[PDB]
Amino acid sequence: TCPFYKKIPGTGFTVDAFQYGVVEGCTAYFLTHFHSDHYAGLSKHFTFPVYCSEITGNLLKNKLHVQEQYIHPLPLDTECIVNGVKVVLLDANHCPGAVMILFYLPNGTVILHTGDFRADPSMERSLLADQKVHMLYLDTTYCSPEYTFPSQQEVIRFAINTAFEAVTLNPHALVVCGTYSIGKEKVFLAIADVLGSKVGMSQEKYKTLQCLNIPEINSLITTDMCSSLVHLLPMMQINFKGLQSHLKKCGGKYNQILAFRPTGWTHSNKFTRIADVIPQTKGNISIYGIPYSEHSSYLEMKRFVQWLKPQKIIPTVNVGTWKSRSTMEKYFREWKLEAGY
Ligand code: NI
């Protein structure tokens, strides 16, 4: 059974609710982004209307084989009527194709559903500027002040400089980058651009990237592993054993691996600066964990919400424990007393 925080009151709509069977009263199922916790339940046998971005719809058709007749892609930043209700999709600054949804209810209430997002001051000049929001359904993944991390730009600067130094010292080093979902493509694309290489990967991952509308992508990626000195591998293989095994397969072309694991936050963020990050090393293998986030830090979240000034907040993450729920409610009240709404 579908939880309340996935239903939009006064509509026939649900958000990210495909694992509950046929939801009573649902006339349109929205999907914010193509991550498995959110699409859980979708397949070629789905026969209800799915509303989403163009990029999410390419992934639904090619990767999950959803039939074309049920995919309803909407342009961004454009007022659209769905089943008699005005909606707008906005860029969530999460993974490719990820959106927030603005619903203009027939009674006059306005609801923002963030999906998964990384709040940014650029959102203060979207179509959100133009009117008031009564209810905010908020991605609270890192809603506590311990969760700090650098800008995506500082993290990419670190990765490019680290990879370029290593491969210039040793032209026989291979760079490997972990992945287990869409998102964080800038990591491997930026490193391959500074090295003058295409990115090599499996046919399955190549197919996924081909659905993302990235400009000039045919110039940047390949399935020919032998032609590339930046390889993608599943995140589970980014360990000394899995990397040793990979290096065997490259037929003596390389004599060193430098590998990256983009994580979210880790507790080494509570002590260390990005500049000071060091790898784990075993012999001719080194592994860097880099804190590349596609979710809001605590401070970015708090700025967005203090700007938006919603009348009510409904968290969509960390809702399963009383301790988490009580923590989140305390920060919401601080924010409101500090800003005066
Ligand atoms: Ni996500």
Swiss-Prot record:
Record annotation: effect of changing D139N: Impaired nuclear focus formation, reduced interaction with PIAS and increased sensitivity to cisplatin
Subcellular location: Nucleus
Tissue: Expressed in brain, heart, kidney, liver, pancreas, placenta and skeletal muscle.
Impact reported for H295A: Impaired nuclear focus formation, reduced interaction with PIAS and increased sensitivity to cisplatin
Induction data: During mitosis. The mRNA encoding this protein contains an internal ribosome entry site (IRES) in its 5'-UTR. This 5'-UTR generally suppresses translation while specifically promoting expression during mitosis, when cap-dependent translation may be impaired.
Superkingdom, taxonomy of origin: Eukaryota
Function text: May be required for DNA interstrand cross-link repair. Also required for checkpoint mediated cell cycle arrest in early prophase in response to mitotic spindle poisons. Possesses beta-lactamase activity, catalyzing the hydrolysis of penicillin G and nitrocefin. Exhibits no activity towards other beta-lactam antibiotic classes including cephalosporins (cefotaxime) and carbapenems (imipenem).
Family designation: Belongs to the DNA repair metallo-beta-lactamase (DRMBL) family.
Subunit composition and interactions: Binds constitutively to TP53BP1. Binds CDC27, which is itself a component of the anaphase promoting complex (APC). Binds PIAS1.
Name of the molecule in the record: DNA cross-link repair 1A protein
